[PDB]
Amino acid sequence: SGLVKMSHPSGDVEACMVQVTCGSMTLNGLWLDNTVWCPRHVMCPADQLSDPNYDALLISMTNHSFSVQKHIGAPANLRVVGHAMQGTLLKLTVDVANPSTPAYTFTTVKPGAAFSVLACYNGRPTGTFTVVMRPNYTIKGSFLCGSCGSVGYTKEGSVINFCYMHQMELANGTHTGSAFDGTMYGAFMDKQVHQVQLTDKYCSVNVVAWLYAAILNGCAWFVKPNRTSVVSFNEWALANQFTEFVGTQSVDMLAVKTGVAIEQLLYAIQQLYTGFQGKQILGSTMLEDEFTPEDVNMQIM
Amino acid sequence: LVKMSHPSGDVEACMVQVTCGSMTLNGLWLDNTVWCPRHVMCPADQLSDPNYDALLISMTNHSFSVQKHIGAPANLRVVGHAMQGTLLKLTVDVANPSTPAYTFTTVKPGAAFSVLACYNGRPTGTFTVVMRPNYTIKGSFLCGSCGSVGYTKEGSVINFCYMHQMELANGTHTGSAFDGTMYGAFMDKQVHQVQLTDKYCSVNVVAWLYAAILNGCAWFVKPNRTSVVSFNEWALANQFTEFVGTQSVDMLAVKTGVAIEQLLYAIQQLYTGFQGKQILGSTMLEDEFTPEDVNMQIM
Numbered sequence: 102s103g104l105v106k107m108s109h110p111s112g113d114v115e116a117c118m119v120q121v122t123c124g125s126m127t128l129n130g131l132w133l134d135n136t137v138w139c140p141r142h143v144m145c146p147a148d149q150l151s152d153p154n155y156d157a158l159l160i161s162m163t164n165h166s167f168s169v170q171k172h173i174g175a176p177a178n179l180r181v182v183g184h185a186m187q188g189t190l191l192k193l194t195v196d197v198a199n200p201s202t203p204a205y206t207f208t209t210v211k212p213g214a215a216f217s218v219l220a221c222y223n224g225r226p227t228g229t230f231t232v233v234m235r236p237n238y239t240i241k242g243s244f245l246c247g248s249c250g251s252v253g254y255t256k257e258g259s260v261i262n263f264c265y266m267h268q269m270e271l272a273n274g275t276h277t278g279s280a281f282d283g284t285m286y287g288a289f290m291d292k293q294v295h296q297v298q299l300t301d302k303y304c305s306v307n308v309v310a311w312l313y314a315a316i317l318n319g320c321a322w323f324v325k326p327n328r329t330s331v332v333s334f335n336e337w338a339l340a341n342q343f344t345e346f347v348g349t350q351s352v353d354m355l356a357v358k359t360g361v362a363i364e365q366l367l368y369a370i371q372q373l374y375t376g377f378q379g380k381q382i383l384g385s386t387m388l389e390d391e392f393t394p395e396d397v398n399m400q401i402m
Numbered sequence: 403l404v405k406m407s408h409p410s411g412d413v414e415a416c417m418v419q420v421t422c423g424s425m426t427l428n429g430l431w432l433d434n435t436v437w438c439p440r441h442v443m444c445p446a447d448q449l450s451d452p453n454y455d456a457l458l459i460s461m462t463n464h465s466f467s468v469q470k471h472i473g474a475p476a477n478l479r480v481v482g483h484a485m486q487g488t489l490l491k492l493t494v495d496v497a498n499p500s501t502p503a504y505t506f507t508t509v510k511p512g513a514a515f516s517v518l519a520c521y522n523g524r525p526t527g528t529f530t531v532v533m534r535p536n537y538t539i540k541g542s543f544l545c546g547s548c549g550s551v552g553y554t555k556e557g558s559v560i561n562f563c564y565m566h567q568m569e570l571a572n573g574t575h576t577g578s579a580f581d582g583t584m585y586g587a588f589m590d591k592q593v594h595q596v597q598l599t600d601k602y603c604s605v606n607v608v609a610w611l612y613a614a615i616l617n618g619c620a621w622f623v624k625p626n627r628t629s630v631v632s633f634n635e636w637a638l639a640n641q642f643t644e645f646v647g648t649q650s651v652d653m654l655a656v657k658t659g660v661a662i663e664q665l666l667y668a669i670q671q672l673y674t675g676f677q678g679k680q681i682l683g684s685t686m687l688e689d690e691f692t693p694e695d696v697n698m699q700i701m
């Protein structure tokens with residue numbers, strides 16, 4: 102069917118991973134120029150992790166409280182000379198700028214958008230994969246203990262956009278983290294207390310993209326003349342666990358290429374949601390919302 | 403359970419662009435050798451059935467050009483060309499300073515490897531595939547992707563196992579092992595070629611059922627068992643591969659209590675239909691996760 106889960110080559114980001122340690126707590130960090138980023142629950146002792154006091158934990162610290170090492174590529178003479186708190190992240194200043202710092206930005210990711218994740222353990226990259234920010238502001242990653250501070254990113258021209266630093270696993274196999282302004286996706290708390298997510302929805306625009314990808318690979322039995330307006334679809338969606346459909350130029354390109362209108366697919370989504378009646382789309386019997394329109398454009402062209 | 407692949411920095415440092423006349427594609431730069439698919443020598447017109455022996459003869463001392471775009475750029479000087487099955491070994495006068503420790507393996511069907519997709523010698527994407535029972539992969543490759551490289555990483559050693567060569571009649575792909583021989587014996591020539599029928603990788607379906615049981619979804623576990631011998635006889639007539647168990651599958655059986663043979667019987671049932679229910683959110687047998695996947699990701 103042509104659609105694999107593709108990630109950005111991780112070499113750029115691999116060169117920026119470090120191990121942050123704070124006493125005997127240790128996790129992963131991002132070394133960009135003279136700054137190391139890592140989640141702030143590294144100051145916390147396991148005992149006090151159930152209801153900690155980060156401002157208290159912070160004034161407790163000085164530069165000497167933190168140690169940063171680099172285990173990958175050229176070794177790791179790193180002296181912390183500054184430290185600040187920023188939302189749920191620590192902002193350490195180190196005395197050596199990273200020579201491997203890529204061109205980069207900090208931007209928050211919206212639901213339905215896809216990014217690449219570099220899973221790291223003790224400052225060592227181990228695996229990469231790709232996730233879609235869910236409507237309930239979680240991601241379904243593969244994160245084992247020691248993975249906090251793993252980094253999520255997308256790439257533009259030469260510009261890496263860092264968008265996600267791992268922090269937590271909720272009661273399902275479900276993860277959340279921070280943007281690089283310190284805020285947490287979905288407003289979860291970096292405290293080991295029971296926290297429930299909101300119910301998830303389908304990303305409508307991605308389901309439309311996948312449907313276009315089927316029409317592009319000669320699977321179009323679900324296409325009829327009938328149409329549902331966008332405004333009509335978004336009303337129906339509020340009551341059916343579906344996100345507002347918001348069009349883009351990527352979607353529009355697929356509409357022109359296949360010659361099938363958005364409104365035709367919004368209608369089909371409404372019929373396929375009640376069940377495929379035992380037929381198959383691209384090898385599947387359920388709606389798929391993990392491929393963005395940009396992905397279909399890249400892979401199917 | 404996510405489709406997860408090896409971080410690619412090491413392999414990115416070995417990708418280069420090989421150029422021959424008016425043809426260009428990717429190559430791999432190890433020590434003093436650049437590997438790449440031999441049809442770089444074939445003019446676009448004459449791919450229909452080429453004479454690779456003649457083409458290598460017609461090569462001169464500057465018929466090949468190799469550029470490194472990633473990292474510190476460089477023009478590498480070719481100082482010798484050899485063929486080996488469906489690959490060229492070009493010798494260059496500079497050794498890749500970023501050559502990692504590597505080996506040249508050949509994936510058996512069912513095995514998963516990481517792919518680094520390149521265009522014009524620049525990496526653009528990485529994904530993971532399982533070598534299919536019919537020796538194709540379901541990749542995402544466009545034109546210019548030839549010479550893209552598949553690998554696994556045992557410890558700190560990179561196991562190079564695939565160099566990409568062609569797209570078959572469906573959206574399916576195949577390429578060379580690094581001994582120059584093409585998975586599935588497809589030919590590097592532009593002709594219609596028949597792939598054999600695919601099959602489910604029995605041991606991966608077994609792995610996936612274990613990942614279900616590990617995650618609470620154990621409804622399909624009845625006390626009935628089918629023996630490996632029995633199942634294998636059944637597989638020959640139900641599009642399944644011969645089951646060959648491993649120490650990795652045994653880990654899943656020990657940390658679970660369910661025997662390999664119970665799940666072999668379950669597969670004979672689930673093949674007929676899920677009877678309404680679902681396993682890990684699915685209504686079909688999943689066979690793209692290996693026992694090592696389930697071990698690593700549900701430790």
Ligand SMILES: CC(C)(C)[C@H](NC(=O)C(F)(F)F)C(=O)N1C[C@H]2[C@@H]([C@H]1C(=O)N[C@H](C=N)C[C@@H]1CCNC1=O)C2(C)C
Pocket residue numbers: 439441449543544545546547548549566567568569570571575589590591592593594595
């Ligand atoms: C798809 C096409 C009809 C063009 C053809 N297929 C068959 O000829 C078949 F029918 F035999 F398979 C085919 O792939 N090629 C024709 C010619 C080389 C190869 C080729 O251009 N390969 C590129 C990788 N080296 C990548 C391709 C580009 C499209 N997507 C890919 O992955 C050789 C087989 C020697």
